[model samples]
Target: ITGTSTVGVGRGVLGDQKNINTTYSTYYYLQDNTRGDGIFTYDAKYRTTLPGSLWADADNQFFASYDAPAVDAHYYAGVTYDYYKNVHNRLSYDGNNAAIRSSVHYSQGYNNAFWNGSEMVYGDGDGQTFIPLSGGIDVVAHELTHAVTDYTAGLIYQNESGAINEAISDIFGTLVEFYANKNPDWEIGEDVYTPGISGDSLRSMSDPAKYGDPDHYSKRYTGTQDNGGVHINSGIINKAAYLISQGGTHYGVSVVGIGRDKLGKIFYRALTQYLTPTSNFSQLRAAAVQSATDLYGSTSQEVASVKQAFDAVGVK
Candidate 1:
């Protein structure tokens, strides 16, 4: 009980060496105390349960097949925390250093991950579709960002607002990936999705059409499935975000790329301050415009670029 948690170093799921925040109570664990009081990782053990067990290790050299997902879940969670704190000057998901808990190997052969309205839950995907969901840092960040939205914008989980919620996750996740600079690209889940497939991803921020997702407002899905196509329609907003950060021409509309840093600032501001739970695509355009204006002035190229990006995606 004296030194409950001890710091330890270990190789992650991908064989990348990194320092793991280990605790040493009865047994060594992966509950990191460096970032916050409650940043913890657990083993779901391929069962549908909540926080199955605190990850335990002896020498801190994780090498078991199951250890892979645990390593990534813990490591990427820390990276995401660092991104918010260092880049955005925000604490954890709730902006108050909230406990970051994650469960890996959730359910047998599952193929998805989510925030679960509480802790992060990752599945060891069916091998054909994915390996382990945690293998993708962007996927980890994307789910954690949902927690951020719950605390800040409280974006509703259906219809246009839901699409905005999804897009926000994709946008911040991509930024976090870029910040980490580990094979950074404007694609989501590229690292962990369909290992056999080459040059593809679950979704593409630059060109959503690649995955059969809509890339413009005119192409948005208004159906009832997927919570009004939250995942599908988000491609439109994702495209606008890509254009704002990377600048691109879509359907004859050209946008002067404003770069990723400014893109994060503007979108973060809008998500935290301007957008409401019911904000639609048009409202999002206005919120982004005001956010860019507030950050770089109305006449600045940043504001112009934001406007042009949204227009390029037909958001207006």
Candidate 2:
């Protein structure tokens, strides 16, 4: 829809007040024209249909309980877009300023979110397992990073490649969380997950085993479930990433922390320049090492730490 770009006041699912980019014609619509082509959010109306209705408001104020998810989805998508543009120097998920879009309140008790190869879709959880998923910045970023991966590495979503894909999303998701500077941590989906619980999250990049995920390659799940354990086996790479950013010792292996910025650079370089659709864990190690080498040279500590991080995670 065509309209003059404007700003709107809204409360997110977490009940935090913030300003959102919206478009105004006869009514305020959740179509942010500020970033890239635009960031469009839609209301799914508890149905399975995609991108349902463009969220419109009689007034530019969004404070209703039903409006919370759309506000967060639209706001967080902008944040994710800014992270890529400012931090990685990439325009958008496609590196060409693709328009970002999302749908919220998808189905009754949907309890999940995904990229779906096109736009993003967030489910209003059963109120037990999750709330509105877009409320979690990490969750929104994680889903958006899937779009980034599809446009870049095009990693197959199965087996080792799938695990790497998941970890890449987790890594960038955590990075985006830190970029937003909002209670940053290495946890995934902590905000929207289990509103009744505390100190728990969907996954932990720092300690994957805290949720029974394997932190070492030897303990990786080989089952065929979950697209060859894409989510389950991602712990190995997630731990490696955590070690790369914040060093730790595991199973007699120690890595010197190289901090988050360099970690992001190396991984971004690898994802864009080295990783392939079928790359596995050992190949990922090589890619990260080569990526670090490319960015900081062969003799740089960045390269050394990349090697150590993979070693610590037993990726060899």
Candidate 3:
């Protein structure tokens, strides 16, 4: 919908008050024109249809319980866009300022969210496993990063390539969480994963094995389930990423801390430049090494840390 850009006050699923960008024609619509091309959010109405309806409000205020997911989805999309533009110097997911779109309340008790190859979709969980997935910034960023990967690396989403794709999303998702400066941690979906469980998350970058995910290549799942264990095997790469940034001893290997900024620079460079559709775990190690070498020189500690991180995860 065409309208003047406006700001609306709203509460997210977590009951945190925030302001969202909106568009006003006849009614305030969840179409934010402030960034890139735009960020549009829709209400799925608990149905399977996509991009169901453009969220509208009589007033520019969105405080209703039903509006919480839309609020967070709209707001977090903008944040992710800003992160790419400001931190990575990428215009949008496509590096061309393509319009970002999302749909909330996707289905009844749907426990997951995805990119759908076009737009982001969030599920309103069964209130036991999750609430509104959009409530988690990392979750939103994770999905949006899939769009970024689609446009760039085009990594085939299966086997080792799929695990690499998943890890890239998790890495950037955590980076965007830190960029937002909102209780940043190396965990995914902690804010909206389980209402009853405290100190738990969907996955842990710092300690993937805590959630029964393999932190080393030797332990990677070889089963055919989950597209060759895309989500399950991502822990190996995720742990490597964590070690690259924070420096940890995994098994008998040790990595020197390179910090998050350098970690993001290396990975982003690898994703946009060196990685390919079929890049596997070993290829990912080489790409990260080459990326670090390009950015920080072959003799730089960054490059050494990249090598150590992958070695620590038994990638080599």
Query: Per-residue alpha-carbon lDDT of model 3 for 200-233, expressed as tens digits?
Result: 9999999999999999999999999999999999
Worst 10 residues of 2 by lDDT: 307-316
Give, for candidate 1, the lowest lDDT window spanning 10 residues: 1-10
lDDT of 3: 0.95
Cα lDDT tens digits, model 2, 59-90, are: 99999999999999999999999999998999
Q: lDDT score, residue 248, model 2?
A: 81
The CA lDDT of each predicted structure is 0.90, 0.95, 0.95
Q: Which stretches of candidate 3 lie over 4 Å from their true place?
A: none
Ranking 1 against 2 by TM-score, winner: 2
Q: Write the per-residue lDDT of candidate 1 for residues 266-299, one digit (tens) a residue.
A: 9999999999988999999999999989999999
Q: Give the Cα-based TM-score of candidate 1 against the true structure.
A: 0.97
